[PDB]
Amino acid sequence: LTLLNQEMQNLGIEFKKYMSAQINDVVIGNDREFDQDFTKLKARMVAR
Amino acid sequence: LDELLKTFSVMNAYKRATESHPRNSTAPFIAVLVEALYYLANELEDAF
Amino acid sequence: LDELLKTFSVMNAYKRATESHPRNSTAPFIAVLVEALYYLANELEDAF
Amino acid sequence: TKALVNEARTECDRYVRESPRFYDEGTFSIYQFRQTLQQTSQGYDAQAIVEAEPAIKELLKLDFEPKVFNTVRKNFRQTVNNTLKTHLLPMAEEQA
Amino acid sequence: TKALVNEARTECDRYVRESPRFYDEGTFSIYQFRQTLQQTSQGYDAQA
Amino acid sequence: TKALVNEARTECDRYVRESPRFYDEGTFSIYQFRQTLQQTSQGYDAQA
């Protein structure tokens, strides 16, 4: 039981790391999928 | 040391800087130098 | 703004810099500028 | 989604305000209506005004070509990145 | 209330970016640290 | 093992402190950011 409680804590720590990494990559622009949409957005707006 | 500095990239240092400030999504344009020193030293320490 | 910058002290900015790096007990001698911007902006944001 | 929509509306509304370039006499003079009105348009049809369409289009382009490239290329990217980070991280901490 | 808070944060965050005036050498030169570092601060105290 | 680990960390941490050579203007000038910032980087992308 005490071992289980320790594992519960790690899940929270790991979850924050994964979420931060995903959000952080978008800021740097490493996420290629997000960039494609953004440039598409800019092109449409200028064309409009 | 030689391998680490030869493969050094400015973007990775910038990426680390943003994580250090969860309340902001930009950098002063100078923190890359600071993060490089900490990143360079901390990685070197781990090898030791 | 006027009160915050007039009471600004270099030591407090240095103190914040050290906390940002739990694996080190010194600073590159330049991070005070970076911490000042983050500290100055974050405090200003809270007032808003 | 609510915040971003407000950001766009609160920023696009400023475009209505006339820029200094809008009053550029060389590109277009507002008194040209006198030419169409000084015993030239005897009927209330607003038809002779069509002749001035090419000139005003240039004036709008000069006024509106800025305030749009500046917006999308400079500020819009920053707002999206900051908004996503500030709303997600506290949510993740709450979930933990 | 939610929208206005986002407006302030999304606008105050840009202040961190260094303005061209920030690099005004006449008002302050970043190399003054050499004066305090070129055999002038022999202790890692960050006092000078 | 404990003592040696402390010896390495207590010695590698000093590397973060900037050496006098770090401020060598000839090899690199910190004001080059003005060239990329004086109406040269209109987007907050940190790409130039």
Automatic annotation (TrEMBL), chain A:
**Which residues belong to the signal peptide in this entry?**
none
List the subcellular locations: Membrane
What is the name of the protein in this document? Slr0869 protein
Organism listed in the record: Synechocystis sp. (strain ATCC 27184 / PCC 6803 / Kazusa)
- Which part of the entire protein is covered? 484 to 531 of 812
Automatic annotation (TrEMBL), chains B, C:
Intracellular or extracellular location(s): Membrane
Q: This protein's superkingdom?
A: Bacteria
**Coiled-coil parts of chain:** none
This chain belongs to the protein called Slr0869 protein
The organism named in the record is Synechocystis sp. (strain ATCC 27184 / PCC 6803 / Kazusa)
TrEMBL record, chains E, F:
Tell where it localizes: Membrane
Specify the superkingdom.
Bacteria
What's the protein name?
Answer: Slr0869 protein
Q: Which portion of the entire protein is included?
A: 629 to 676 of 812
